[PDB]
Design a protein around this ligand. Structure first.
Ligand SMILES: *Cc1c(COP(=O)(O)O)cnc(C)c1O
Ligand SMILES: *Cc1c(COP(=O)(O)O)cnc(C)c1O
Ligand SMILES: NOCc1ccccc1
Lengths: 363, 363
């Protein structure tokens, strides 16, 4: 697929850009350009191009505005010491976007086109990638929306793929700070036969009240329990969870299994591998509130943390739920939690060896 | 709220508008204008206006395009013999949009403003309302979308309410026709506590695969079973269901109760009342597949029909599911099914007495 480039004539000044890169926050500012690719049944994906970041046009009856047919992804681009610009496992995101697409009846975007859109945007907006050897990065947000007009309920026949970038600092206010969680007694993030395994906007809109309630109960984030038995721990907001049993090199990690409604996080998959590389025993099984509170209080469960592209790893220190409340260890980020975070971020920044070939060059 | 009007300087010629009204189909064509109301935290709902139907603009990071925070409604405008333009229970739609808004963390729109937008649009696009004495109408689609830019996950602080209209000709052009249904064994429409009771786009995008599967099994529409026991019948696509036991004046009606996950259909609410007015005994309870097939085969269940705004009432004649297949009576639309459809549409068209005061003037 051939991309055409229409340069932004009035991009952010070097001063404004530098200012942003110094204090970017998350998903607040956007680069000067974006990638756009159209889709029609007859031409498939076409009219791929790099254009200036700006307002999009949609018919009032566009399917995405009524029946929420949309999906998204989230990955990062990093600037290395040698001046190269790389991304962490972009092939995985390409593949998951196709998985989310299938579950939502949206045409798949070829992985080579996905990866190419990334290279094209960085080619024009490389100066928006943060300096090497830092916590900052450039968040890439690939997404697809149904654009065909018509109020009839059915899969759209026209779509638009968009790629925008946003300098990223720290998703959670604090970063090196553990969060408290409220286990939702009233809400579920998904159920068997649902869209829990797809990175689909609908999933997030549905969770807003549950998060609001977590905050009203005096907690930072909501944690999801299975929709069937209302007993098994799944995720924290839109992040996977890990439980650390014991400590030192003999410690073991437990994380909820991919039941079918759980979203297969790439950070999760990576951490399981890194844990094994380190020598820790890992296990993907079901774990319920009862065992959690019991072993945490007992001291067997020494740490708990959430993981995801945006925050990478976030320590969990306190738990509150319909039938109890307890703290994890001393309420501070655990040894293992931080050891794994330093290793993962180290690989992403080019500091540590990438033995699994996870880093790919974008430039 | 005061509405400002910006007339369409390029409206559809009389030739085009007339050709559309002669064969409008459904949700295919739109009138010359649309209503728009903006929402910000400091100004609340404001800048209410009637403007030309046309493409709207959104920032690429608009929340609705990433985390599906949106909701909608569906009602109709009818032209009566006396020349008036009326609507069926529009106050109920206003109330439901508020209910959907609350579940999706979206600011509620005052019922007074909702009704006003309806009056305002009809004021300029009255010519698009079909002739009286027929079964055609003007479908009204009110909806709210989150427009604030920002990739962080949280309720939007900026919204836009839009009201568009689409002519809708006779649903059943050549005589009413019954549909076949596939009871979904693999998918669920919603889970307890979820967003099943809200008119939210996400619910529909998630159902696309299940409908495609129903068709692949050789059926017209997909029917939903409860997410818990996977045995209790809920709805057909985006329409409620009714079961007719027996026949004649002593017939009895049974419909799934509002378990909390079912969508409180307005057509459904109306039919339960009309059934009572005719002297039919009614029941709002759970009914499983076993009872359905068993009693349908024994001839106790004589009819089944689905209901909703667009089609009003659609007969269901054939059922197929994981463990069986059966037909309802003679496979034709039942007596009670058509009697009730004739009564309801008669009230909407102004032919029968509106004893409950459901019809409201829009003009
Ligand atoms: C995106 C997402 C994650 C994390 O996936 P990463 O690939 O690690 O970024 C976890 N859970 C849900 C529900 C998600 O949508
Ligand atoms: C809109 C809708 C209905 C029908 O409601 P009416 O008010 O009768 O138009 C039924 N089920 C679902 C899931 C819906 O979204
Ligand atoms: O990926 C979903 C997500 C969006 C923004 C922040 C965290 C997670």
């Amino acid at each position: 697929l051939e991309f055409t480039v229409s340069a932004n004539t009035n991009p952010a000044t070097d001063a404004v850009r530098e200012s942003i890169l110094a204090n970017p926050g998350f998903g607040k500012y956007y680069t000067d350009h974006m990638v756009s690719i159209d889709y029609t049944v007859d031409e498939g994906w076409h009219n791929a191009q790099v254009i200036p970041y700006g307002p999009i046009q949609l018919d009032p009856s566009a399917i995405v505005l009524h029946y929420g047919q949309e999906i998204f992804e989230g990955l990062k681009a990093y600037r290395w010491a040698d001046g190269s610009i790389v991304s962490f496992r972009p092939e995985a995101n390409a593949a998951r976007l196709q998985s989310s697409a299938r579950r939502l009846a949206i045409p798949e975007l070829p992985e080579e086109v996905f990866i190419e859109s990334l290279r094209q945007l960085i080619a024009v907006d490389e100066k928006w990638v943060p300096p090497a050897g830092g916590e900052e990065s450039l968040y890439l947000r690939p997404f697809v929306i149904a654009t065909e007009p018509g109020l009839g309920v059915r899969p759209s026949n026209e779509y638009r793929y968009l790629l925008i970038a946003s300098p990223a600092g720290a998703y959670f206010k604090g970063g090196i700070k553990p969060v408290s969680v409220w286990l939702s007694h009233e809400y579920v993030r998904a159920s068997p036969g649902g869209t829990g395994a797809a990175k689909f906007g609908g999933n997030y809109a549905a969770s807003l009240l549950a998060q609001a309630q977590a905050a009203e109960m005096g907690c930072d984030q909501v944690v999801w329990l299975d929709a069937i038995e209302r007993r098994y721990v799944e995720e924290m907001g839109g992040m996977n969870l890990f439980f650390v049993f014991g400590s030192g090199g003999s410690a073991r990690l437990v994380t909820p299994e991919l039941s079918g409604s759980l979203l297969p996080g790439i950070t999760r998959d990576s951490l399981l591998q890194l844990a094994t590389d380190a020598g820790f025993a890992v296990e993907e099984r079901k774990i319920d509130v009862d065992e959690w509170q019991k072993k945490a209080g007992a001291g067997e469960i020494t740490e708990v943390f959430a993981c995801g592209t945006a925050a990478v790893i976030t320590p969990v220190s306190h738990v509150k739920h319909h039938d109890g409340e307890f703290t994890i260890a001393d309420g501070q980020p655990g040894e293992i939690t931080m050891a794994l975070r330093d290793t993962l971020t180290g690989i992403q920044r080019g500091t540590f060896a990438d033995t699994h070939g996870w880093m790919a060059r974008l430039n």
